[PDB]
Amino acid sequence: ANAQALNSLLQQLFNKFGAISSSLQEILSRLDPPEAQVQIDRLINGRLTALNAYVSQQLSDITLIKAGASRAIEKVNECVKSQSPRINFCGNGNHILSLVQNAPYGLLFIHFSYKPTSFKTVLVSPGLCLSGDRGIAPKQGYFIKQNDSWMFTGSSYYYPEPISDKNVVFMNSCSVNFTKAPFIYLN
Amino acid sequence: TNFTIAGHEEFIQTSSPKVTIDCSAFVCSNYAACHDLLSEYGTFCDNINSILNEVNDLLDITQLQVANALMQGVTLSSNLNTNLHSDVDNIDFKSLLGCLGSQCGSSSRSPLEDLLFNKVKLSDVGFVEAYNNCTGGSEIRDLLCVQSFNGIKVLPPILSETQISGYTTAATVAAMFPPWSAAAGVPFPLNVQYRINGLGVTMDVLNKNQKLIANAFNKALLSIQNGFTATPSALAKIQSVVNANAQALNSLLQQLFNKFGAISSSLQEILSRLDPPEAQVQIDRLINGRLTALNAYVSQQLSDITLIKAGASRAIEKVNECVKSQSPRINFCGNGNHILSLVQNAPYGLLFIHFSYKPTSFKTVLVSPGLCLSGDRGIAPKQGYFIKQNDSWMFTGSSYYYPEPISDKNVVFMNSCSVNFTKAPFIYLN
Amino acid sequence: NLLYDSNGNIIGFKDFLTNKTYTILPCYSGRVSAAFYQNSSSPALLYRNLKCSYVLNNISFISQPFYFDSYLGCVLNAVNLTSYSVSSCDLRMGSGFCIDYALPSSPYRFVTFEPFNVSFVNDSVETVGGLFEIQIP
Ligand SMILES: *[C@@H]1O[C@H](CO)[C@@H](O[C@@H]2O[C@H](CO)[C@@H](O[C@@H]3O[C@H](CO)[C@@H](O)[C@H](O)[C@@H]3O)[C@H](O)[C@H]2NC(C)=O)[C@H](O)[C@H]1NC(C)=O
Ligand SMILES: *[C@@H]1O[C@H](CO)[C@@H](O)[C@H](O)[C@H]1NC(C)=O
């Protein structure tokens, strides 16, 4: 696009623009001096208009260029040299880390993500209530029922583990939509 | 002491109507004697067409980006809403959902979007319905038919409004039924409780006022739906954009009736009254005037497309970081206390629905930023304060008054206490 | 003897030798959008906002063996195959439609443009036995 613009800017020097010849040499030594300004002015007006249009196009493009560059700077500072807690910014939700490389007229990014391959269906419970009007809710995971017993699994893997203090939050009440389990004596 | 939930709407412009101008149909004439002189200017009208095409390409690119941001990481079940219960946990979401079942085709707009689309005439379908009437028999006078025959016509986008409405109503049900993609795998009421818990409200009051939260959500949705009968700000901005586009299109057409130092605005009168060898001056004057007008128009378009792109990027960022996921950034998705956010399709942009946490009653109480325990040990509260009740130290939240005993789950420990901390040797672990 | 509008447009005329009133409507002057493949032989014409009942007898006198009306005007040298959708398309027309080329009648096919989809899973929505049912990697 830059080369096409530069080539189109040069081709405007071979235009007549309402004159008798598209050349400043074929006008001077072809008429009397008083009858040359009328054509030189018309030759100058078109070139000035073309230059103004080119300057306007450059001013319109530089704004988007600077906006993209600022976005690139922000993305570098928030994804390469740091791990921001922002989601759906450096990747597609499962972003891990990113690297930066030099590229012609810009920069190159390499985003690493977390892509699962296999899946497995399982019934989950979004919270339980223990004996004594006490309720518990999982933190980044679910509650499964394996061998008439409740366990805890992650939201992105299926490795069962027993319920502990660092894997569940404690509440002093629970609604009627949760599942009752009075045999979980893991306080 | 008491709280409620309030709603708030917001509109962000994303797209703009695509305008196309003809090279020779508008500059000189449908004739040929004028075109024989326009060739002396070289490829001057080709450069005008090398700007609107790029503007339309940028508009298509940003529309595809918005669609991708709406449809990224979204998975639904096969047993979809086939006339099923659109309400979950006493929360009526039917007023902002279309239809995604096997039936109900060729129409996917929600009842909320219909109120917005029925108050604008120059929508995506409006130009299509107003342009095809210029042949089968239109009214006595129509501006769009006159502008179309002179080289000014508005092209429809690459994606219809129905597809955008479908994308929106599919992204809305994401955080409504398992699996919860837009809630990171958390049910809707538990997600709302987690959102409102981060402000300082304890879990003891949330479980006792679930029906209150449901009624507050229903009342907020009803107030947002009924607020479109009057003149709101989003509809005002949409009408302003439409009127500005119409005024620009009408002002661009009036340049064909100016004189521009010539003898007459009509080009046929100059060629049917004066001899050939003197009409070139008038033709050149008219050509220069109309080319200057077209250059001014394309310059204004290039000036507006930058702000359009900026608004579209802002809308994309909001869609990515407010509705599909929660970002720990205050005063970004709303006004202070922010809980959730919803997106709806709007003419030439998107419509957002923000839910906030608005208290009702207040109470004055004495608080302490920290106390010193026995043994030069320190302790400071987190997301709350320290209050005294019946000559005993307890803990309370920063957004709700509910005393609770001090435990290791609500405070932090320090190896040294400051000199401006209230002494309290009576408390050991209570 | 003349009727004008708000901004300098003649939209009427009265004759003085016949005492009859007429109405002036401008003539048709529009372009055509034609999609052309890499090494095809004839593009796919598209007259926007024009029915083929008016094009086949007032615009183009060439015998067109293929024509059918659509949402954006009738398309020439194409087939009505809107029941088939594509993901990526290089000839975009608008309103969710595009034209793709298939190497063989009319090789141009008028299809639907659906660039984004959603992953479907065969699971239940309502709670079964008080528990949900989701997929875990
Ligand atoms: C088109 O319409 C005009 C307007 O009506 C017609 O002009 C009218 O023509 C009639 C018949 O010639 C005139 O009536 C005459 O009036 C004189 C008195 O002035 C009377 O002595 C005659 O016996 C006759 O009744 C009428 O005045 C005249 N109106 C005007 C305003 O000039 C015209 O004839 C119509 N043209 C055609 C082709 O029908
Ligand atoms: C939609 O499906 C098509 C065809 O399977 C595929 O090419 C395209 O990448 C899909 N889009 C998304 C967003 O998954």
Curated annotation (Swiss-Prot), chain A:
Glycosites: 147, 177, 187
Function: Acts as a viral fusion peptide which is unmasked following S2 cleavage occurring upon virus endocytosis.
Organism (species): Human coronavirus HKU1 (isolate N5)
Coiled-coil regions listed: 1-40
Name of the protein in its database record: Spike protein S2'
Origin: domain of life: Viruses
From Swiss-Prot, chain C:
Record: glycosylation sites: 19, 39, 58, 80, 117, 122
PTM: Specific enzymatic cleavages in vivo yield mature proteins. The precursor is processed into S1 and S2 by host cell furin or another cellular protease to yield the mature S1 and S2 proteins. Additionally, a second cleavage leads to the release of a fusion peptide after viral attachment to host cell receptor.
Localization per Swiss-Prot or TrEMBL: Virion membrane; Host endoplasmic reticulum-Golgi intermediate compartment membrane; Host cell membrane
Note: Isolate N5 belongs to genotype C. Genotype C probably arose from recombination between genotypes A and B.
Subunit field text: Homotrimer; each monomer consists of a S1 and a S2 subunit. The resulting peplomers protrude from the virus surface as spikes.
Family: Belongs to the betacoronaviruses spike protein family.
Note on domains (UniProt): Fusion peptide 1 (FP1) and fusion peptide 2 (FP2) function cooperatively and have a membrane-ordering effect on lipid headgroups and shallow hydrophobic regions of target bilayers. They are considered as two domains of an extended, bipartite FP. The membrane-ordering activity is calcium-dependent and also dependent on correct folding, which is maintained by an internal disulfide bond in FP2.
Record's protein name: Spike glycoprotein
Species of provenance: Human coronavirus HKU1 (isolate N5)
Gene (UniProt): S
Residue numbers of the full-length protein present here: 646 to 791 of 1351
